[PDB]
Amino acid sequence: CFTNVYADSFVIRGDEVRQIAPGQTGKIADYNYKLPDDFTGCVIAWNSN
Amino acid sequence: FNATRFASVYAWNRKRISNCVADYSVLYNSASFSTFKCYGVSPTKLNDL
Amino acid sequence: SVLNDILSRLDPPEAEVQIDRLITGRLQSLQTYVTQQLIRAAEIRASAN
């Protein structure tokens, strides 16, 4: 059971998959989308090639 | 970094760099797709020492 | 074995695993010293009596 759930959706190319990880920072990620070190939850990429 | 020919694996070319100022911001920015994963040190601007 | 060198060379999420083992070693040293001091104090108290 959880207090609340937040869902975030955006398109990211497969070359950019490695940089979008919890705690693994990247320049393009650091200026667009940063994840906290203690992030709890799941990150899923859905096939849209 | 920007050269013409690179040596083979079995005979690898070693270069010595000393007595200058090494700005590590250009390497990180240009050709960002190039892998830049570091051991022992953090490339996240903590390379200025 | 220098705290500042660890802090001035690594980003936090990988510096933590180094700080932790330094902390464990130093805590062990302090605990051993305190135990020996307690035993020595007991002997000195017997002599004073």
Interface of A with B in 1-40 (CB under 8 A): 15, 25, 27-28
- In the structure encoding, which two tokens stand for residue A22, read together? 């919890």
Asked if C11's CB is within 8 angstroms of B44's CB, the reply is yes
* Cross-chain Cβ contact B33/A15 below 8 Å: yes
Cα–Cα dist A35/A6, whole Å: 13
Please report which residue ranges of C1-49 form alpha helices under DSSP H: 3-7, 12-48
Cβ pair C12, A37 in contact under 8 A: yes
**Closest CA in chain B for residue A30:** B44
List Cβ neighbours of C8 (8 Å cut-off, separation of 6 or more): B46, B49
Partnered with residue A21 across adjacent β-strands are A24
Residue B9, C-beta contacts closer than 8 angstroms, at least 6 positions apart: none
Decide: helix, strand or coil at residue C45.
helix
Asked if the Cβ–Cβ distance from A27 to B33 is below 8 Å, we say no
What is the structure's resolution, reported in angstroms to one decimal?
A: 2.6
Residue A24, phi then psi, degrees to nearest 5: -95, 100
Q: Does B33 touch chain A (CB under 8 A)?
A: yes
